[PDB]
Design a protein around this ligand. Structure first.
Ligand SMILES: [Ca+2]
Ligand SMILES: [Sm+3]
Length: 136
């Protein structure tokens, strides 16, 4: 949500899975029940392109079965030269989605989300939100 919303101009690109029933765009549509899901082996990933420069102060991720999540960021014109930012190990809760809040600051033009491992044969991402401001 927020900065990551497609309604704000952002877009999900270069996803490693493209299931017609669960497209990448589902990660940034502001709907908790639609999601992108993995279809192959790991690591799996996707990149969020802001199509502008932003300064992030908080990230919120809603997912399922994600075991280890790595978040990288770039400030380049193209999705290149990413640098490791956050590497989090999420917990699995029976019958519940994962809701993780990450308070960290960083400038970026793109964010790369890597599902390093999952608690099952697949993992899903319901939403990715970033709180912050756009820089001109
Ligand atoms: Ca969604
Ligand atoms: Sm670890």
């Amino acid at each position: 949500i927020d900065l990551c919303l497609s309604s704000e101009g952002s877009e999900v690109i270069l996803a490693t899975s493209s299931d017609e029933k669960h497209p990448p765009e589902n990660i940034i549509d502001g709907n908790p029940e639609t999601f992108w899901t993995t279809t192959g082996m790991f690591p799996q990933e996707f990149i969020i392109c802001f199509h502008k420069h932003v300064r992030i102060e908080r990230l919120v991720i809603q997912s399922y079965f994600v075991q280890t999540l790595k978040i990288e960021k770039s400030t380049s014109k193209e999705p290149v030269d990413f640098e490791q930012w956050i590497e989090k190990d999420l917990v699995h809760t029976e019958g519940q989605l994962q809701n993780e809040e990450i308070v960290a600051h960083g400038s970026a033009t793109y964010l790369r989300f890597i599902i390093v491992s999952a608690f099952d044969h697949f993992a899903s991402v319901h939403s990715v939100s970033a709180e912050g401001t756009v820089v001109s």
